[PDB]
Amino acid sequence: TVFRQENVDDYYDTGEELGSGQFAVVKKCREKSTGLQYAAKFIKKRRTKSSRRGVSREDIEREVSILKEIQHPNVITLHEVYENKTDVILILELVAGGELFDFLAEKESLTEEEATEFLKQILNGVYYLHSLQIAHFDLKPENIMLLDRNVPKPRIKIIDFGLAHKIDFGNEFKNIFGTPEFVAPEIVNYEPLGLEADMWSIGVITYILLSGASPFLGDTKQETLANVSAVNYEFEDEYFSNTSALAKDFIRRLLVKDPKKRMTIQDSLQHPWIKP
Ligand SMILES: CN1CCN(c2cc(-c3ccncc3)c(Cl)nn2)CC1
Numbered sequence: 001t002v003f004r005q006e007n008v009d010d011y012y013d014t015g016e017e018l019g020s021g022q023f024a025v026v027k028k029c030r031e032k033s034t035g036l037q038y039a040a041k042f043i044k045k046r047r048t049k050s051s052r053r054g055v056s057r058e059d060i061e062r063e064v065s066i067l068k069e070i071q072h073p074n075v076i077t078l079h080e081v082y083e084n085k086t087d088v089i090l091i092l093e094l095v096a097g098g099e100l101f102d103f104l105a106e107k108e109s110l111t112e113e114e115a116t117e118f119l120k121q122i123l124n125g126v127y128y129l130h131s132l133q134i135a136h137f138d139l140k141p142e143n144i145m146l147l148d149r150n151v152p153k154p155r156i157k158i159i160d161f162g163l164a165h166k167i168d169f170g171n172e173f174k175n176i177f178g179t180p181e182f183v184a185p186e187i188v189n190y191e192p193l194g195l196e197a198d199m200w201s202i203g204v205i206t207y208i209l210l211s212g213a214s215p216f217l218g219d220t221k222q223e224t225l226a227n228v229s230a231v232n233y234e235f236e237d238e239y240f241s242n243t244s245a246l247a248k249d250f251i252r253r254l255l256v257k258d259p260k261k262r263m264t265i266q267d268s269l270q271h272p273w274i275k276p
Pocket residue numbers: 018019020021026039040041076092093094095096099142143145159160
């Protein structure tokens with residue numbers, strides 16, 4: 001598939017940088033014809049078929065295909081796509097309230113109500129994706145963005161579909177691997193992957209939201225991965241002494257090694273800690 005090859009600077013003005021990644025940079029932009037603002041994500045293309053730098057065209061096309069299908073309050077949307085010889089440029093919805101990660105750093109930890117306010121939205125977004133057989137594969141606080149961080153109950157959107165895949169056969173067996181602290185055991189062990197991997201990540205996010213601590217974090221990436229595979233985590237009393245047993249129950253049913261025994265997104269929405 002081919003994208004718009006006109007110079008993006010002919011249609012948009014760019015501003016402040018909103019994010020920087022291994023092969024991507026995000027800049028705030030404004031469309032000249034409407035005055036509306038967006039987030040422009042510049043993704044570096046591979047220069048040769050046998051290169052490790054840049055993103056393969058197959059990977060870029062997959063991300064765009066997935067982004068073009070989604071429209072939900074809790075997920076980012078795609079406005080337009082441009083490309084030149086160096087980059088593919090995604091013009092995405094602007095989410096200007098910052099990362100959930102940064103919001104958490106400001107509060108240290110959240111009350112159960114504050115945590116479930118965010119979690120309900122994350123679950124709603126993931127329910128939408130899973131309904132479409134889309135696995136995100138990179139859920140973490142840095143990939144959750146608030147629309148406005150200065151309101152009592154912030155609205156959030158899931159971003160960064162760079163690792164997302166359609167799961168048409170129940171599982172996929174590809175080169176997929178995200179951030180060590182949030183990946184499921186099946187990712188660590190290079191086993192077939194499905195929608196269940198996202199549910200594990202949600203369990204990790206929940207633990208962090210309630211305690212301010214990462215459940216499997218080791219001193220090195222390899223130690224973290226080994227901890228994940230062994231399901232080496234516990235609820236430290238210092239952090240969870242006043243956390244309800246039902247919150248712990250929710251987490252416990254997500255941080256399960258066997259994906260077939262882990263709660264599904266539908267199960268999580270009906271769990272007594274979440275169900276209103
Ligand atoms: C893991 N990080 C990668 C770099 N980040 C980001 C942030 C954004 C974004 C989207 C909408 N509004 C503002 C920013 C985008 Cl589009 N890509 N990566 C932040 C998360």
